[model samples]
Target: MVSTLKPLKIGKHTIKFPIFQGGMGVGISWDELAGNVAKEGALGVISAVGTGYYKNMRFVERIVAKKPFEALNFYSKKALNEIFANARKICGNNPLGANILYAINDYGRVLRDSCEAGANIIITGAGLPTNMPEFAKDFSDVALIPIISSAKALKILCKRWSDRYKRIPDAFIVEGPLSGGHQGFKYEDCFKEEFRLENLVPKVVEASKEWGNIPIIAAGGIWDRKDIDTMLSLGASGVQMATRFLGTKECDAKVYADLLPTLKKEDILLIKSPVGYPARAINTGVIKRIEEGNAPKIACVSNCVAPCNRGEEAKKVGYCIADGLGRSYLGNREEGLYFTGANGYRVDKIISVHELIKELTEG
Candidate 1:
């Protein structure tokens, strides 16, 4: 097949292009970037990572240290609406989506809020979202797509949905272990070649055929046009990328995205994290401080991750992830937490969203 952009039927809506901007957060792919990407004829997906930080959080009922504390901030409804409003201000009615995780606090409420905030679609991951459709009833037009690792998981979800919500995902994301932040596979399994997206996408594609023409979106290690083409050849209808988008001018987390190109390749390796996953990133002074016993003591602020079980993991791991990631968004390099994909080391220079997209689409 010719390498061309094709419109995709997601539930009832249509994405005129097969590309999707992966959702990242604690302030990564917010309105400015997502809207711009959508306006450029690709899906711009916002991460519901820490919405409580949005517009000072009118939706969050409680606060600590002038910020919505913990997971509540991550899934703040008020913050989500504000995010939609901000994103629309940039894209002007173009299609935009929110990436909410099933592993977070108030998973169901945030899904509903995304629809209420004008999101046309919701991509949930960080865990199997078998009940994705259940929390998505109010928004009939809103599409639900879940990230999956294998066909067996998809089969289980399909069977479960057929028995319960009687619905299936509008699309599926095949995220391999090479991705950034929390990964789907075990830390050790992440290193195995069998779990790579190259091998995984085709299986997802094969499984999807049985469930109908469910588009398969390949993610993890997607860097440039060549990588995109490779995944598509493996039967991916489209591809989702986050790191390149991170470096874009419109990206919400400016410094975090900008750090990619200036990094040493060795700095970006699988590192142990409290989230129980091996995250890849540039080894900043902050991450190094942990090994030196100089990192700050754990404190639950905007407890974004439940798997940490309220700072327990942070205590053992040496720092609070939410606070650390938040610091990165705030541009506090010395103490902030940063996360990047395996290809994050490939970033060389900063560019605008329009520039990055042009480069990817061109040669």
Candidate 2:
């Protein structure tokens, strides 16, 4: 098949394919997935969330109740280094990226650690991330990309970065509500037509022209070559996809890949997150348990995200995000919190990253 997709250039790095595998957390999109994605010539992004859970928590210095003790342990620098090292072994010197959430505990520390761990690009979301560049002052070679939901959000980030750090984003990812895990839109806003990815992309693309013509990467609900072409027609420089990548053999979450085929359209829905955002996830036994008030106790051992308030919000939400997601990472399907994009139910089989990318680009 003749490929219609174009190469994408961000900062000093150029990607062979314009697709970026959106970062997933809690042992998803770690070394194997990110590495192989980059090795396939598209940009592979490592999820910097729950690094302590990497390698069976081997790098964690302290643990309580089978979880990392605190933010230091949960976002272990040593573990991040090891993950990056392993990823480098697969991709060689490809332009590897890291996704670190601004809502996470020790945001600045994790951002710095990701840079030191050899991330060529840093993509952040889960908040406005106004001071994102402040944490990466020493790593000028590392490109900084912020994920935003609207053109206004991009404007706000650009102004703040310009005023405070005299730097604009290398690029911006305009994510819609259909994305997996945490969403920038509120629950009510998610269903609104105006907030859809198609409507959101052109506006952000127009806004990008004002700020050095920053590249816009459209994300969420993008399923095939037609969807990619549609985004490009709307002026997106590239696309970031997570759910489709979850179907790949190189993906770190084997249980998710296995369970994805069994899901129905209604299985994916938005739920309240301890991170103070609405997240889209599979309506599994975990949700059933939470609804019935029989969910696991909130211990807050990891002190995961700042918005969780030491599990205070988790208590209100009826499940500890860190623990629940950690359970999923460990392949405990019964109690685990499985996150997936709106189109996750469409994944019917597992394939290699190479084959998947070929299909996405050629088919």
Candidate 3:
């Protein structure tokens, strides 16, 4: 039987499938993964982090210790443009999106770069992007969506945007603690019953009603068709999933993708992040080294996230996020930090995006 799911409308774009491939960073969800997902009729979102590492750091103007020198090189405008262009080749006018973290050093500049690079939609998280619309003001048609963990966050953002920009988000992704990488909730709150995605979805959906019924996309730990149906039944207009996509053949992080099947529930843990939020990832050797105080020395080469304070937070955390993720991108298993969602262990094998989407939308 055909799926009962309906199309999702955000901004001016009408997505054929309501599934959004949540953006992963440090070379996880790039042109190949995002493009193929969009080509298969879902909303493909390209991550705008670590663009300097794209194509072997060709776009970066400078390099120090084999990493992008600073924020400028780390978030290369040239690489982003090329990535979008390459993705457009596959999707061809399909509504493609870019995910930029608000905690990044050059948030505004990267946001503008994404818009100028032909992103039809902009999805931001990792911080409350209060001034999101201001950065993309030039691109009137570009849809802006923010990921929030609670109804209060959404309400605050709505009020702020309405007051400042005279506009609200095109959609809001209600992400739970089960998501990969950095989380929106406090470490303790992540374990709380009230903070689960199922609990958060209804509240966010209810909150959206006050602002002209803006669409709500439920994210984090949503695995398979039943989960999708559940979120939609709970009043979510759509769902955003990242971990399951890691098993897709089109995903860029082949190194991490290959490691997913070996992961078990016990292997995934919520650990401290330099971003001041709890992040979920696999307990790999890199993590062990960090715990053992034998991890690589901290060097603020990328100056990736604003919250890191130029490696100060990284020193405390015992790993440089840029180097860890960058090494993961380069397929360094022993030293790389591998991030995964709660259900990452369920991904037993790699499949093509077309096959995966077909399984999702069909019975």
Candidate 4:
């Protein structure tokens, strides 16, 4: 089953399957998982999220109390490089990429860091990465992919890049309402029956035509062979999946893999975040308390997002995304914030990254 996915060429790297594993952060997607997937012929993406947390604070800014967050006492610029070195050690010289959020506090630093570490491509989301090309000027070989939720956003980004840097994105990721984590749409918009990926794919495909055939990658609610087939039929050049891949045996942290599913439609929710964006995640006791306006005290540490401002947003929202998510990554179900796409609950079991790649390809 060679798949209709065919060959995908992003800048200089050629991927066998159009399906890509979306990057997980806060220690989610790392060398082991990404290396395995790249070895399987799909582009395996490492999360530049908290590379500072790699190997006992080797790359992080600090660490304290056995927690990456507490490790603020020390940060090693070499942490991210060490992570990439390890990723290469596992995946070899094949084409592997990194996932970085444009909204992070140290976006430029991490971007340059990943490129310096020899990443072939970078996929950024959570905000319009209008400045993405600016950070990549030093690294000529690294491809840049910006995640967008609408044709308007894509058009704006393409026009800005063309006028400013005379470069367009090497690729684009179009995620719909069903995707996990932060979204471009409001919580109410997620329920727009016509707004699902099945319908949004064509609009994005049409938008890409104006951008000179720049590849459009579809995400959100993708599950199996059927999803890959459906998106391809709808004119998508590739598929990006994160939630499904989180269940892989090689997931960087067991805590991330063990998050259970929810039966309530609202169990996984669109909660308020310190970034002032509506983030999608399981509504755990921590979030529930936040909803009741009684979550933990805002310590104002990390300062991980521009919007947080000495944790003021964390004060308003009652939690810092960096703190909560760090807890979840550390397997602290209590006070931890677990993030996932809308379709995350469908993940029922775990599989090896090689097996997952085989399933996506052989289906």
Model 2, which residues run further than 4 Å from truth? none
The 10 consecutive residues of candidate 2 with the worst lDDT sum are: 1-10
Residue 251 of model 1 has an lDDT of: 79
TM-score of 4: 0.92
Select the stronger candidate by lDDT from 3 and 4: 3
Looking at model 4, residue 188 earns an lDDT score of: 87
Q: How close is candidate 2 to the true structure, as a TM-score?
A: 0.98
In Å, residue 306's CA in model 1 sits off its true spot by 2.2
Worst 10 residues of 1 by lDDT: 1-10
How does model 4 fare in lDDT?
Answer: 0.78
Model 4 Cα displacement at 168 (Å)? 0.9
Give the alpha carbon lDDT tens digit for every residue of 246-322 in model 3.
88888988886578777788888988888888889899958988778779878798899888899999988788888
CA shift at 5, candidate 2, in angstroms? 2.2
Model 3, CA-based lDDT? 0.90
* Alpha-carbon lDDT, every model: 0.79, 0.91, 0.90, 0.78
What is every candidate's alpha-carbon RMSD to the true fold?
2.3, 1.2, 1.2, 2.6
Tens-digit lDDT track of model 1 for 1-363: 233656766777777667789998778887888989988778899887777665445567788765566665557777778778888888877788899878765788788888888999999887878898888887888888888988888888888887898788888888998787778887789889899889998888888999996988999889888898898899998889997887777878778555776777788777666666666766885788877878866667677777888888878767777777766776778877888888776777778887777767653
Q: Measured by C-alpha RMSD in angstroms, how accurate is candidate 1?
A: 2.3
What TM-score, computed on C-alpha atoms, does each candidate reach?
0.94, 0.98, 0.98, 0.92
Cα lDDT of model 4 by residue, 13-129, tens digit: 898888788888677788888888887888899887755556545555545444455323222247666767887887788888988877765788778877888889999988999
